[model samples]
Target: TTAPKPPSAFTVEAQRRVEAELPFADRADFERADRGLIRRPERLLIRNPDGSVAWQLGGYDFLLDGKPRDSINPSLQRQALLNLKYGLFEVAEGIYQVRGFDLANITFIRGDSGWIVVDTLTTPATARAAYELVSRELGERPIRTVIYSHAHADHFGGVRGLVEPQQVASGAVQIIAPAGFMEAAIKENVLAGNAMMRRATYQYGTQLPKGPQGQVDMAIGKGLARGPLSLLAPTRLIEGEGEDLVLDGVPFTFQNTPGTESPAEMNIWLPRQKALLMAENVVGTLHNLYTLRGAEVRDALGWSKYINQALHRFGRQAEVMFAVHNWPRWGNAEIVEVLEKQRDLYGYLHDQTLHLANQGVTIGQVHNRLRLPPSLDQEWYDRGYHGSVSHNARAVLNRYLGYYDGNPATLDPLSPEDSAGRYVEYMGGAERLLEQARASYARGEYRWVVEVVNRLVFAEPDNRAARELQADALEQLGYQAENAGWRNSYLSAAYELRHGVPRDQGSADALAAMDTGLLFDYLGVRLDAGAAEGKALSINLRLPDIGENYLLELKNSHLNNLRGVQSEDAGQTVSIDRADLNRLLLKEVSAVRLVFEGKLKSSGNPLLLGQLFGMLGDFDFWFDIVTPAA
Candidate 1:
């Protein structure tokens, strides 16, 4: 078994070297927000047989240590352009980018007759800007088709603004999606969106800055966009593994690589251009084999297998490979290197951990020795930008073997806080622990100092001395992280440890897409269970124009959307114009207006649907959490 080791001098020396590479040279006010890399650099993406170059700029430099800061630098009292955001970029030819929204940048592709929009972006506003950018650069054009490579919100939210819901209702345009996409998107991601969004602060380094040692690159895009997120179910779902389609004169062959990047994800092969769009299946940076924000652990074994499958399908035919994030790989050989290494990256992690466990090696022991060969390890793509091998090995072990060392003393250990209290009690008290922490701090044992001081602080939270010392240790640690998530995790924790949770975090108002039906779909997921206890009925919500009909059923303490079919005369039918639904979704008018305007007319009890609406919870973008003062 491997014991937890504090920061030794050797580790500190290596960390200091890492910190020195940060893009802090231009930062004049390190203590103030006077310097901010609001946008990342645009990499021209020089593709080579051996390697590729993503020449991008812009970054975030969070106020981890020194003094406090926000998007607006205290020294100038004005928001810098760096605070605005990283501008959009072109991933390849027809593909473009606007990053830092989620973990990966959303990609948009062009077609002959109209645009075939990929990934809708995290919020409506960001998605709108992204689409408008295409118009401004590629000349104004209509969006005829949308393909959600997966079910994640960032891929489907911007649909309302780019294409008319009326057309979709009327069956004018098609929105393609993978099989089981809606179920996972609704059940898994939506149900947990609130808590996950909060925990995501640490997961993606949302508040961390960009520099050599700071949150340079989050595992996902820089952070989750605060604007509105939306969704539209596929008119035709891709059922088979090799589903093929052509939209607006462009042909695409879809390969279902589920259980990898997301619950419902796939890669698209555009035969017309001889390019394989990897979607989120293969991103530039090393993604989390297990994300910190928390979800079902993704399957590394399956993820690696899919990449090999892609290598078999399109490796010889496609010369260029583009994705939703980072940049594109121009040549076949270059794309192969990234794809295969990323494949082995996950495969090696999965196989090697299992190998070690078979020999009775504990997870901690595996974490100590499990490492990729230099070919896989040294490349920036395979390096630990978000999910390090240490955590991933543990994740792989947990998924395959479960967490048991075959010993009993480690079984049913006390919670972290309880363990800390016990350890503190064993020692003298707060004062004695403080003295020891201070001595460790003097020796530059920063991680140890932080850990020991954290126990003291948790034991005696009001101890200002403990808080201050803990703060000091976090600053040093943040300074040394090569990845943005690591930097933010350390810095955000330090801030919380010092000042408590942030009650106000700006606003919740969505900046972009606005559609009533998507809002209804989202709210349907949040219906309060006990309130909906004794309900058994159905309602056919007809969006006449888009040929869209949702027969919502409420029974067995659950609400379900049966869009394509209708049951034998069950309950009520409320028929209304799509525009009114949009207005309600945008919450533009009062609830009473539904009856007054005649858009909502139910013969029996009109309030049934209204009650359903009331029972469901709406996400308030303006809800105060990160910005309590606001």
Candidate 2:
């Protein structure tokens, strides 16, 4: 194992530049993050039954003290330092939060008879840990209600950790959420789950070891906690904005803010506390319009509108505004200013990007030109930690103009491999390109260096010099990046380039809890169209445990599935338990193994079953992105 190194001189210089520019005296956040700390765990560590470390505060031990490091961005370093201040924090008289306990904060609001938990953390282990902290400080109280602010896994995946499903089922512990919450939650988790989780490894810096040279703050929090994830569909849905509900004697006014940080999300207002819970809608940092892990582009206009509405509706009354991520902001005037600036920030990104697009400016050109005006630029929350102006500005263009920039040349551009070869040839071979890239790197033109050296690496994947130089370019870019995701992605790419793809890496079985019909949707993507070109077949599956029958058909190079019914003319029919079907989707057992073991009973042509399996293409989670074959 290699020892982690401190930042190089180039990186140190870059960090020094940041230190000189940023306003160090703006100590509001540092103060706010430490506000109302009841107590922190002496040794915060949550382990699995088998003694494997699930979540631990020691991962951020390096961040306990010391000035900003050369290897870490000054702004991000501050955020990281605050994230290590984990414990129970009283937000107001009745509302409390367990911050820095997980990637998302777990909140506890005192009700008449019990406590209402809002926005559970990522995993069961972390959620329970947060619950323990709250219980230790505030005294144990039965959870009267559980409110999910959004549909993201981090918001609702820890339901089982804090409260039993039986309690929710018994209507003893009411579960509440926004409309379409369940659909979005399961859709985001199960659909393309394997790929999403794999990309999340890069986005959240989960694969990197915890240190200055490795993973630190993920912009919003320290990092995602490790453990089993769970989800419980809400028993009550907040369907519209301005909806008011009295849960356990605590009054709440909900704002339905869809297409903000998440596709389905909501913010809450507590009339008694004069507090606003912004969910993930208005975070302390410039939130992501498009996360690096990859998702549908967010509606910036919609996001801004919601914040604008919050300002006009609750800004005057709110004494404090807190979010699922980051620290709380107190004072009505300050809260209003925060909301207005955040609203304007998103609005500016949306409106300006569209203005540039209308003027025939390409997405790249629009991104280069777009910037937050002076009014919002001075705000600390406007800083790019989770997201940036360039990527988000580009995302606005992506939403409206689609990928094409009215440039016919780019309409159907050559594949990366083909283009890389041509680019290399135009540059007079890989050796000549390497020489230019080295000079570019020396001049601190890291972006330019990356663009040029990437072609050389792509043209000749086995070229050691090209690979190493490309990694060098990426590392420098990572060092300079303020956005945590950008830094992590760049560094992770460099790590992979130097060390090669990880052999033991694969996504967890996140789809095991999903419905059986969803499994077929995942399988549909794996159908090799070329292999199914002339195929016309139908197979009926009877999964009694799930109480669902599916008729899967492949026709005209397309695969379609019908749940709760089957085609009468299907060539074959198979009977399997849903438990086994889950194993099949999870890849715990192969179709061949099931067939040979007599676990899978089939009728009507057993040979047809072989043909069905042959048409499927196995997806490799670690498919190469940096290097393309020529």
Candidate 3:
């Protein structure tokens, strides 16, 4: 492995500027973060059943010094230092939180006879650890209810760890979530998951070492837990604008904030404690309108409106406000101030971006020109540790105007590799371009160097000099980045360029968790159009155990499934249980073996089933990103 170089002169200047410009004098966040700390584990290292580490907090001891390294952004170092505070802490009279266990915090609220758990951490191992800590500190109590604030995996993936499915099924424990939570969760994790998971490596810097020069904080929390992710469907769904429920003895008013931070999200207000759980809506840092790991662009206007509504509805009564990420805010005045600033943050970003776009500003140029007003920019919470104003501004443009900027030159451009070859040839030659890039690099123009040298790298993927130069430039950009996501992405690209892409395994449990309908949809995504060229076929699929029937049609290389309908003119009829179908889809069982074992049966042209299954392609989880794919 190639050793990383020290921060350049430009990166040092950028860090110094951040140190001088921001409100480093204010230490309120630290005070609030450490307000009610009861106890912290001397060492926190959660391990899976097989004895492998799932989540560890001890490695980040370097950040405890609270000093920024030249190779790390000062602002991000401060955020990381705050995030390093891990332990069981009391939020209010009945509310308690276990932070720094995973990417999100797991909360516990005392009930009449038991405890009400909110937002299980990312993995079972971490969730179990958090629950155990709570039980140990504040006498062991049964979990009466499980509340999922949103559809994000970090909020609910560890449900099985705290409470067994049998408990929910038996009505001993209730699982509550927002409406459309199941569909949103399934779609995000199952349908478009492959690409998102691949991009997530760059977004989280999962492969990077933990140090000042490498992965620090994810901005939302310390880091994600590396363990098996499991999900249990919510028993009760909260629909529409808002609903009130008495979870155990406490009164809870749940305000559904759909399409805000997540497609299905909510905020909870407790009148007795005058505490508000902001879910993922009002986290400490500025959240992402468009996440880098690939997903739908959130509505900035809607996001602002939701925060405003929450402010008017519950802001006055809230003595303390806690979120799924970061620490809690205590005083009503502090809560209101943060809420207003956050509300205006998204509103200003949306309005200013559109205002510029209306004036003929293109998407590429909008971010560079748009700047947050001093009022919002001065606030520490408004700072972009996870989502920067620059990228979020462009995201606003993309939401309203789409990708095209009305420029004919950019309406339809050549592919990156094709354009790179032409660009390199037009620039006199590779050697001349490299020489010019080296001079630009020395001049502290790392961004320009990356842009120009990328053409050479793309033109000749094997060019060692071009790759090394691009990596060096990207490394500098990473060192200067205040946003953890941006920093991780830059460093991840640099790492991939120096060494070849690392290998990783895909998630088979996610596929196994899918229902029949979602599984069928995934099958359509896996179908290779080239392999099914000029093929028109229909099949009647029957799952006797689940009492479900579907007619699958294949035409024009598109797979369509019609539920509860069987086509009379179908070429083949197949019968199999949903469990066996899952096994087949997961590649655990072959069609021939299933048929021989009497688990699957086919009538009328059995060969057609084989032909259709043959067309399905397996996704390559380790696909190249920095380099061109073959």
Predicted model with the maximum lDDT: 3
Candidate 3 residue lDDT tens string, 431-464:
9999999999999999899999999988999888
Model 3, TM vs. native:
0.97
Ranking by lDDT: 3, 2, 1
Model 2 pairs whose backbones collide: none
Which candidate tops TM-score?
Answer: 3
* Candidate 1 lDDT over residue span 1-630, tens digit each: 111124445445754454353333434222121122223434312121234322223344342232322212121111112222344555445655555444445666678777777777665555665566557666787777777888776677555656666889887778888887776565554445676677777655555545433344444454455544466667878876858787777788999987898877889998877888887878756778777767767799999999999988998888778777654566778778878898999999999989988988886578887878877875655756667787788888888877787678888887555677777878777888888888888788886887677777766666777777787677666655544455677766666555666558611123123233445556667887787888776776766645666777888767777666655564666766666665665567665787787666664455667767767764543232221212
Note the clash tally of each candidate: 47, 0, 0
Better of 2 and 3 by lDDT: 3
lDDT of 1: 0.64
Quote the positional error of residue 437 for candidate 1 in Å: 2.2
Better of 1 and 2 by TM-score: 2
Q: Candidate 3, which segments miss by more than 4 Å at Cα?
A: 503-509, 512-515, 588-599
TM-scores, all candidates, are 0.71, 0.91, 0.97
TM-score ranking, high to low = 3, 2, 1
